[PDB]
Design a protein around this motif. Structure first.
Motif, short mmCIF file in Angstrom:
data_model
loop_
_atom_site.label_atom_id
_atom_site.label_comp_id
_atom_site.label_asym_id
_atom_site.label_seq_id
_atom_site.Cartn_x
_atom_site.Cartn_y
_atom_site.Cartn_z
N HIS A 45 37.28 22.84 10.33
CA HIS A 45 38.45 23.73 11.00
C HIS A 45 39.61 23.00 10.85
N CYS A 46 39.56 21.55 10.58
CA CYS A 46 40.71 20.67 10.07
C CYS A 46 41.43 21.17 8.98
N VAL A 47 40.73 21.71 7.94
CA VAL A 47 41.34 22.03 6.82
C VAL A 47 41.45 23.72 6.61
N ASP A 48 41.40 24.42 7.91
CA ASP A 48 41.46 25.96 7.57
C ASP A 48 42.43 26.46 7.13
N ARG A 49 43.68 25.45 7.27
CA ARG A 49 45.24 26.13 6.89
C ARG A 49 45.36 25.52 5.82
N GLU A 50 46.15 26.30 4.80
CA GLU A 50 46.70 25.94 3.41
C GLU A 50 47.81 25.08 3.49
N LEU A 51 47.77 23.83 3.81
CA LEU A 51 48.77 22.95 4.07
C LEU A 51 48.81 22.05 3.12
N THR A 52 49.27 20.99 2.98
CA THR A 52 49.41 19.83 1.96
C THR A 52 48.98 18.66 2.89
N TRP A 83 30.71 27.86 6.80
CA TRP A 83 31.34 27.70 7.86
C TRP A 83 32.32 28.93 8.27
N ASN A 84 32.39 29.54 9.39
CA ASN A 84 33.28 30.81 9.64
C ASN A 84 34.46 30.33 10.81
N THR A 85 35.46 30.04 10.28
CA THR A 85 36.57 30.25 11.32
C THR A 85 36.76 30.75 12.49
N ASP A 86 35.98 32.00 12.64
CA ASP A 86 36.07 32.81 13.62
C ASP A 86 34.78 32.51 14.76
N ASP A 87 33.85 31.63 14.31
CA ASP A 87 32.75 31.24 14.98
C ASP A 87 32.69 29.71 14.84
N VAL A 88 33.19 29.09 15.66
CA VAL A 88 32.88 27.39 15.69
C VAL A 88 31.80 27.13 16.24
N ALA A 89 31.33 28.08 17.12
CA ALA A 89 30.25 28.08 17.69
C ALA A 89 28.73 28.12 17.19
N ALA A 90 28.72 28.71 15.85
CA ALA A 90 27.77 29.06 14.67
C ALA A 90 27.50 27.82 14.24
N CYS A 184 39.38 15.10 22.68
CA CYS A 184 40.36 15.98 22.88
C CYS A 184 41.27 16.45 21.67
N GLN A 185 42.06 17.51 21.48
CA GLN A 185 42.77 17.88 20.23
C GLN A 185 43.43 16.75 19.45
N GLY A 186 43.10 16.76 18.28
CA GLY A 186 43.56 15.65 17.39
C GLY A 186 42.39 14.61 17.16
N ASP A 187 41.48 14.61 17.84
CA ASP A 187 40.12 13.84 17.47
C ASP A 187 39.26 14.45 16.68
N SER A 188 39.37 15.81 16.58
CA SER A 188 38.31 16.73 15.59
C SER A 188 38.29 16.10 14.43
N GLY A 189 37.13 16.06 13.67
CA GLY A 189 36.94 15.62 12.31
C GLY A 189 36.38 14.03 12.36
N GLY A 190 36.94 13.41 13.61
CA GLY A 190 36.57 11.88 13.39
C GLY A 190 34.89 11.70 13.85
N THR A 206 33.39 15.14 15.25
CA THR A 206 33.83 15.79 16.51
C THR A 206 34.24 17.34 16.24
N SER A 207 33.81 18.35 16.88
CA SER A 207 34.18 19.41 16.54
C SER A 207 34.93 20.34 17.67
N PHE A 208 34.37 20.34 19.02
CA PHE A 208 35.09 21.32 19.93
C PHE A 208 34.82 20.60 21.26
N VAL A 209 35.63 20.99 22.54
CA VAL A 209 35.83 20.77 23.61
C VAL A 209 35.64 22.11 24.40
N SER A 210 35.60 22.12 25.67
CA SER A 210 35.84 23.26 26.42
C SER A 210 37.32 23.87 26.46
#
Ligand SMILES: [Ca+2]
Length: 240
Positions: A45-52, A83-90, A184-190, A206-210
């Protein structure tokens, strides 16, 4: 990381900062782990966006020259096919980034050790979470690399109605949930680094929090369980 403390410089040398171009500037968005001299493991979900994107290795203080940094671009992004962007809990919150160049290994920059496939930790196993993310809920990024001691919460517990219930899958790892320390947000992917056989290995991405907040009693931080993805990881690196 909520409730952490500053890491020492050479403490977690597989930790990366995943950054994106924001005008003429670059912003930290996610953690990663360095798994080959030219491969990074992070959350899809860190790379879901088409960013550089770009990767920084040997990084400690985001704002300042450390004298240890290496800056590399991202050549190819491989997200888990399921991976489904709309379902992180999957689950399937995992991606592999092939770097434009091979980094130089030194004491600031090492490869992460991954677990053997199928490996599951005992409850209350000693792990640390690392990252530059928010140091409070709705707060700000850490300038410096923060570490928090965040023991595991087993599946039977983490999937019970008090904790995460059904949201959590056996392809995930929970850790923490004391109400004090968390990712917390910004730690995802680590990484979630876990001590096994006197070695630290990387058991979680790291994937998600409440939605309630980062540090919430009985809502541990949830990780992609790396030991569930070993053959996928090896099959990508082998054919790319
Ligand atoms: Ca720096």
């Amino acid at each position: 990381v909520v409730g952490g403390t500053e890491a020492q410089r050479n403490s977690w040398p597989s930790q990366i900062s995943l950054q994106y171009r924001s005008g003429s500037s670059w912003a930290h968005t996610c953690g990663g782990t360095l798994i080959r001299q030219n491969w990074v493991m992070t959350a899809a979900h860190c790379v879901d966006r088409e960013l550089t994107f770009r990767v920084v290795v040997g990084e400690h203080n985001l704002n300042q020259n450390n004298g240890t940094e290496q800056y590399v671009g991202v050549q190819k992004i491989v997200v888990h096919p399921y991976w489904n962007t709309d379902d992180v809990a999957a689950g399937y919150d995992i991606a592999l980034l092939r770097l434009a160049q091979s980094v130089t290994l030194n004491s600031y920059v090492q490869l992460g050790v991954l677990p053997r496939a199928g490996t599951i930790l005992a409850n209350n196993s000693p792990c640390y979470i690392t990252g530059w993310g928010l140091t409070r809920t709705n707060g700000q990024l850490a300038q410096t690399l923060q570490q928090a001691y965040l023991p595991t919460v087993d599946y039977a517990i983490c999937s019970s109605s008090s904790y995460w219930g059904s949201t959590v899958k056996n392809s995930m790892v929970c850790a923490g949930g004391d109400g004090v320390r968390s990712g917390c947000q910004g730690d995802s992917g680590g990484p979630l680094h876990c001590l096994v056989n006197g070695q630290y290995a990387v058991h979680g991405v790291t994937s998600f929090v409440s939605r309630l907040g980062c540090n919430v009693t009985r809502k541990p931080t949830v990780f992609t369980r790396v030991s569930a993805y070993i053959s996928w990881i090896n099959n990508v690196i082998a054919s790319n």
